[PDB]
Amino acid sequence: HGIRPVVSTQLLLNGSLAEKEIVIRSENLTNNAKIIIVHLHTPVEIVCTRPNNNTRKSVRIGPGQTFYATGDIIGDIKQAHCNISEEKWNDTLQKVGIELQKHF
Amino acid sequence: VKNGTVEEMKNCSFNTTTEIRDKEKKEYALFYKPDIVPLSETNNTSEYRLIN
Amino acid sequence: QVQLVQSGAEMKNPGASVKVSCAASGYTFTDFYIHWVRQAPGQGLQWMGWMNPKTGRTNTAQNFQGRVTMTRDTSIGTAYMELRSLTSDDTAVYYCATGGWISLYYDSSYYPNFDHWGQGTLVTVS
Amino acid sequence: QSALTQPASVSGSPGQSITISCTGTSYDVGSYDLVSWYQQHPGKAPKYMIYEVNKRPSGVSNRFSGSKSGNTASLTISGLQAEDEADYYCCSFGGSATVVCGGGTKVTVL
Ligand SMILES: *[C@@H]1O[C@H](CO)[C@@H](O[C@@H]2O[C@H](CO)[C@@H](O[C@@H]3O[C@H](CO[C@H]4O[C@H](CO[C@H]5O[C@H](CO)[C@@H](O)[C@H](O)[C@@H]5O[C@H]5O[C@H](CO)[C@@H](O)[C@H](O)[C@@H]5O)[C@@H](O)[C@H](O[C@H]5O[C@H](CO)[C@@H](O)[C@H](O)[C@@H]5O[C@H]5O[C@H](CO)[C@@H](O)[C@H](O)[C@@H]5O)[C@@H]4O)[C@@H](O)[C@H](O[C@H]4O[C@H](CO)[C@@H](O)[C@H](O)[C@@H]4O[C@H]4O[C@H](CO)[C@@H](O)[C@H](O)[C@@H]4O[C@H]4O[C@H](CO)[C@@H](O)[C@H](O)[C@@H]4O)[C@@H]3O)[C@H](O)[C@H]2NC(C)=O)[C@H](O)[C@H]1NC(C)=O
Ligand SMILES: *[C@@H]1O[C@H](CO)[C@@H](O[C@@H]2O[C@H](CO)[C@@H](O[C@@H]3O[C@H](CO)[C@@H](O)[C@H](O[C@H]4O[C@H](CO)[C@@H](O)[C@H](O)[C@@H]4O)[C@@H]3O)[C@H](O)[C@H]2NC(C)=O)[C@H](O)[C@H]1NC(C)=O
Ligand SMILES: *[C@@H]1O[C@H](CO)[C@@H](O[C@@H]2O[C@H](CO)[C@@H](O)[C@H](O)[C@H]2NC(C)=O)[C@H](O)[C@H]1NC(C)=O
């Protein structure tokens, strides 16, 4: 099946979903140095944005090749940020709690 | 940026060699501060460098 | 409750520079953008600029970029606007108005939501 | 040079409906929702009437409404009275982080 080559740390984005329950995978849960992969049954939608209106400026470096950099910021300065719904994330963390409590 | 500073970007100016290799022109660009490292321990706080 | 108080009327010679003041009340001068607009006698409105009074970022139209300067004092809640190189075109009534909501997450600068208006100052050039 | 375009004068009898047009370009008015309408009586500051094409602030009933289609917008007055004679100004987002206002429209009541 079509694997998305998504490069991301500390969370998994746009992946496949488990069929009926949240599945917790580790090589051995006793060892602390193993990354515990939690696979969610239902996704949590995250929306991310950069609000400040940058522009692109080309600088010709050498023969026939260019370097693209940031020019002016056309507007006002705002914070780049991501948003997650709080209730759904709290519910997801409680569910990860119960299938972590299956092993503890 | 318009009569107020940004905390993440520096307005770095540098002398680019143009396509004519004996001639140079001054250019400027706005660089993010994770990309920018101060150059050395010399007596100039306004001279920087790429992180590469 | 929310009301904007400007300065008195001024008359100057051409080639000088004028400073229009704008005193805020009610909303403690922060948390809202402030837009400066102009109206020639018998003519329509002309927008001159905005100021972000929290962080001091100011912007203005492409016709006015060399001649206008917007500053503020947040302790008393007052805005100042200097116009330089006065001509016979520049005699007009000048208005100070509120704007959008300063929010740190989305650009509310270009929202033409002018809630409360000042009484306007007549600047005469002769 | 860069101001918006409006008709010079629209007139009507009491009890009718009056439409004022506000026409700019694709970058200014046709780009965003940000269109506002102000009413001015002579000798005073303009009064806040319509913001964001069709929304209304406090103190304004359904006498005034707005619409937008393409590069133009419109103000509508329903149930015209003698108090509605005024100047009406259209301001909008003006491109490249700017707002722009045009030459207003004189409404005279018959
Ligand atoms: C991610 O995530 C994030 C988060 O985290 C995000 O962010 C976000 O975003 C969003 C977007 O949208 C945003 O939102 C926004 O917001 C804003 C703000 O709000 C706020 O504030 C307000 C004000 O406050 C004031 O007032 C009050 C009363 O009201 C009081 O109480 C207070 O205190 C204050 O006071 C003042 O003063 C003082 C002194 O004294 C000082 O100190 C202070 O500071 C101040 O200044 C308020 O109000 C609000 O609240 C509200 O809401 C809530 C929730 O919903 C609720 O609960 C409440 O209750 C309220 O309500 C409301 O409504 C109601 C109805 O009925 C009424 O009644 C009441 O009264 C109220 O009003 C808050 O707190 C806002 O404002 C906005 O809105 C606006 O805007 C828009 C656009 O812009 C529009 O469309 C709308 O319509 C509106 O408009 C309005 O306003 C403006 C100003 O702003 C103006 O200009 C206009 O014109 C209008 O006005 C008019 O109209 C009205 C009606 O319509 C009337 O009323 C008036 O009067 C006039 O006439 C928006 O919403 C947010 O914020 C944010 N956040 C943060 C944190 O920032 C992001 O985005 C994300 N991202 C992504 C990508 O997603
Ligand atoms: C975020 O920034 C972008 C730029 O990175 C900005 O978009 C730009 O808006 C301007 C309008 O202010 C556009 O400029 C126009 O370009 C067309 C090209 O066909 C011209 O025909 C236009 O000319 C008219 O306006 C001039 C004044 O600017 C007059 O001098 C002229 O005689 C004409 O009346 C005009 O130059 C520009 O193309 C866009 N750029 C892009 C990539 O879309 C955007 O507005 C900014 N966003 C916000 C919310 O401010
Ligand atoms: C931002 O602040 C600067 C510095 O105050 C303003 O530019 C100068 O302002 C001083 C007095 O405030 C004058 O002596 C100069 O003639 C001004 N120079 C220029 C080139 O304008 C500036 O007006 C302020 N605003 C903006 C939008 O930059």
Q: Decide if domain C5-125 falls under CATH 2.40.40.20.
A: no
List the one residue out of D97, D95, D89 whose CA is nearest residue D41: D89
What was the elucidation method?
cryo-EM
* Whole-number Cα distances in Å, D56 to A51, A80, D31, D35, D60: 27, 31, 21, 12, 6
Q: Resolution of the deposited coordinates, in angstroms? A: 3.5
Q: Is A77 on the interface with C (CB under 8 A)?
A: yes
Taking the CA of residue A53 and the nearest CA in chain D, the distance in Å comes to: 9
β-partners of residue D93 are D99
- Which domains, ranges and CATH numbers included, belong to chain D? 9-109 (2.60.40.10)
- Which residue minimizes the CA distance to atom 11 of ligand 3? C69
- Atom nearest to A53 CA in ligand 2: 1
Domains of chain C, by residue range, sit at 5-125
Residues of A whose CB is below 8 A from B31: 69-70
Taking the CA of residue B47 and the nearest CA in chain A, the distance in Å comes to: 19
Task: Report which residue type is found at C82.
Answer: E
What is the DSSP-derived secondary structure letter of residue D100? E
Distance between CA atoms of residues A50 and A47, nearest Å: 11
- Length of chain C, in residues: 126
Distance between CA atoms of residues D40 and C117, nearest Å: 12
Distance between CA atoms of residues C24 and C43, nearest Å: 27
Distance between CA atoms of residues A61 and A72, nearest Å: 20
Distance between CA atoms of residues A90 and B7, nearest Å: 33
D63 neighbors D78 (Cβ within 8 angstroms): yes
Phi, psi of C69 (to 5 degrees): -140, 125
Tokens of A77: 């300065």
Distance between CA atoms of residues C20 and C37, nearest Å: 11
